[PDB]
């Protein structure tokens, strides 16, 4: 018999982040991951490393180690992420939290600009998670970085207008987050597109669980998103981002170095991140936000091999 090759109706749009020589393209797939005998894969998955605007306080020693000299300096930390191979740098504005430092959009915007100017790669800016706060800071952030095509992370169903508004006025792209549910990701996309932001300026965040803590739901949701794009559902034809780092390093298997029943801590902590990544790369994710440089390097070597 003959190699079975699917005739796919459509494709995931190509999203471009950054501007000028520091551009990065994602998406564009007209086939399932790596099945290029029946479709195109214009872009390989892309990876980012996280940089916090304020020093992480609850990070395991093994994760701080690769950034120990730059962890208190967002700019230096971001240059280091590029040095470690990140395609994109992801700045998490933790200090914006209203229950924490509750910093203003103006304060936060100066740091996003500082970081942005210092690196030769595109910038992804993640908020604090509190919808109300994020909607307030992103329009100020988007304004300061106007024209730099950054990726503002997280418009949700309850807060997208201010953020989509900032993307459109100031030329940025947006991440649309909905909790592991096709119809909800779809509804959000529809509402964003209703403001006339183009589908190629949107990346879907299904709000995954790491390996062992919800990864199967994440994996299936992402597969349904890719199949949706391929078969023609224009509402699912957007690239997918997975916050791998954030979730994998929360796993006990990756945080408790003292558990003899699970073997060598250093190895399992890293495999926890690399396996969540390879599994979600197999599901159809496009942008992977990682935390540990070693996980990043090994996945990239894995990608060289599978591509």
């Amino acid at each position: 018999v003959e190699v079975l090759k699917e005739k796919w109706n459509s494709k995931v749009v190509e999203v471009t982040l950054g501007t000028g020589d520091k551009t990065v393209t994602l998406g564009g797939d007209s086939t399932l991951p790596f099945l290029t005998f029946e479709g195109e894969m214009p872009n390989p998955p892309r990876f980012a490393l996280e940089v916090f605007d304020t020093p992480p306080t609850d990070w395991p020693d093994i994760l701080v180690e690769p950034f120990k000299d730059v962890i208190n300096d967002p700019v230096a930390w971001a240059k280091k992420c590029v040095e470690y191979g990140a395609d994109i740098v992801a700045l998490r504005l933790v200090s914006a939290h209203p229950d924490g430092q509750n910093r203003s959009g103006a304060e936060l915007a100066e740091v996003c600009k500082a970081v942005a100017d210092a690196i030769d790669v595109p910038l992804m800016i993640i908020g604090c998670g509190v919808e109300e706060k994020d909607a307030e800071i992103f329009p100020v952030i988007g304004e300061a970085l106007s024209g730099r095509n950054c990726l503002l992370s997280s418009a949700t169903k309850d807060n997208y207008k201010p953020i989509v508004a900032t993307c459109m006025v100031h030329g940025h792209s947006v991440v649309a987050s909905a909790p592991l549910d096709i119809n909800l990701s779809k509804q959000l996309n529809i509402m964003i597109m209703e403001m006339n932001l183009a589908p190629n300026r949107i990346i879907m965040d299904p709000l995954i669980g790491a390996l062992g803590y919800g990864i199967e739901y994440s994996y299936s949701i992402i597969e349904r998103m890719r199949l949706g794009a391929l078969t023609g559902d224009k509402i699912l034809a957007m690239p997918v981002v997975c916050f791998i780092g954030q979730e994998a390093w929360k796993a006990k298997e990756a945080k408790d170095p003292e558990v003899a029943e699970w073997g060598d801590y250093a190895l399992r902590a890293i495999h926890w991140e690399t396996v969540t990544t390879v599994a979600l790369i197999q599901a159809g994710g496009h942008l992977f936000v990682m935390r540990h440089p070693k996980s990043l390097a090994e996945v990239k070597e894995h990608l060289k091999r599978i591509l």
């Binding site: 079975l4 739901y217 945080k255 073997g263 250093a266 190895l267 396996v275 599901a283 091999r305």
Partner: protein, 383 residues
């Protein structure tokens, strides 16, 4: 059916693979979790073979309240010698009940099968130039046989030759040189079997993840788990390398239509007295054993109340209005936990700290808000 069911080993240590019908688990569910095999070379000393198999036996992990582990020992006849190989398998057999995959020449497998055949091993390597001798051994012992060839065309033809010889208890090996080829082969085998009823490919496959870089072997094996391998062979006995694979197989092979829940009743950790703490949580098995594990691990005898949230985690049920003050209060009375303790204090997951006041008035129990992660329970109980 699309893919034959094939069994390696016997008696409950048995590995059943095949009878898969979809390419994406959300279409139905994947039916039979792939086996994981660990490699053992017959050139090792008697002492070495035993030490290694003993480490293989320790590649078992409790996950969501169940023991899960690797399932086969792949003995490799690197010695080239049948006497050496036969004795090595006998040695490994003395130290484990896991079924074997016998990797070796026909003469090595035949010596070995005299004693190992009874244990229903998987024979490794009916190839283009030995397939006739291999099929004869497989038939004598009626044991599963791997058909190994480079590429889909060669593979399918060898399979047809062997099935023409009357044997169909098979496992497939398309010999990828790298994981790019591996993904391609696994995907096509699975597609042609299911979408086209292509018979030569209607059998489970075996994959190898032997990379000496352990991050790479783990990633290659992860891809094979997610992508249709029926048996995956590694060469690491490091528990850290197998843990994520076992978890990934558990996860990928879980039925998507329903989460696994635990029965909502009170669970006793260790042998609690009327003085032991009472922990409130949900009946999502993953959540409940996260908690059970932490408590038993700290050696704290206690009572655990997994509120029935239809098997949903704590923030999941909460957001779905299924972990309310009212529901938890009712379980406090529902569960019969009161008869069990002399105090009237219950510990709430720290993540729903807000429910405290309302849950407290209403239930008549003193609600203590615990850490957000069950991992801080030991330090919370100490203080």
């Amino acid at each position: 059916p699309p893919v034959a069911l094939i069994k390696v080993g016997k008696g409950e240590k048995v590995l059943e693979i095949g009878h898969e019908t979809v390419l994406f688990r959300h279409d139905k569910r994947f039916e039979h979790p792939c086996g994981l095999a660990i490699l053992v070379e017959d050139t090792l000393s008697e002492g070495e073979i035993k030490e290694r198999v003993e480490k293989i036996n320790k590649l078992v992990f409790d996950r969501v309240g169940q023991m899960h582990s690797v399932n086969l020992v792949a003995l490799k006849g690197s010695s080239q010698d049948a006497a050496t190989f036969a004795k090595a398998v006998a040695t490994a057999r003395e130290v484990t009940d896991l079924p074997f995959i016998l990797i070796g020449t026909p003469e090595q497998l035949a010596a070995a099968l005299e004693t190992e055949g009874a244990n229903n091993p998987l024979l490794y390597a009916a190839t283009a130039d030995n397939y006739e001798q291999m099929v004869e051994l497989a038939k004598k012992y009626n044991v599963p046989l791997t058909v190994s060839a480079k590429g889909l065309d060669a593979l399918a033809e060898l399979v047809q030759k062997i099935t023409a010889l009357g044997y169909k208890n098979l496992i497939l090996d398309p010999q990828p040189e790298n994981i790019s080829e591996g993904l391609f082969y696994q995907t096509q085998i699975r597609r042609l079997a299911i979408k086209k009823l292509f018979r030569p490919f209607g059998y489970p496959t075996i994959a190898f993840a032997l990379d000496e870089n352990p991050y790479q072997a783990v990633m290659e094996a992860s891809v094979y788990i997610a992508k249709y391998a029926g048996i995956i062979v590694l060469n690491t006995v490091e528990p850290a390398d197998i843990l994520p694979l076992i978890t990934l197989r558990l996860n990928i092979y879980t039925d998507p239509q329903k989460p696994i829940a635990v029965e909502p009743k009170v669970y006793e950790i260790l042998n609690p007295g009327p003085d032991a703490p009472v922990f409130i949580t949900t009946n999502f098995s993953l959540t409940y054993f996260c908690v059970a594990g932490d408590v038993e691990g700290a050696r704290i005898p206690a009572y655990i109340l997994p509120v029935d949230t239809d098997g949903t985690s704590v923030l999941t049920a909460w957001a779905a209005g299924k972990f309310t003050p009212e529901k938890i209060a009712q379980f406090l009375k529902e569960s019969g936990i009161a008869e069990k303790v002399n105090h009237r204090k219950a510990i709430l997951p720290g993540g729903v700290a807000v429910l405290s006041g309302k849950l407290q008035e209403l239930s008549g129990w003193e609600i203590l808000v615990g850490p957000r992660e069950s991992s801080g329970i030991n330090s919370f109980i100490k203080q």
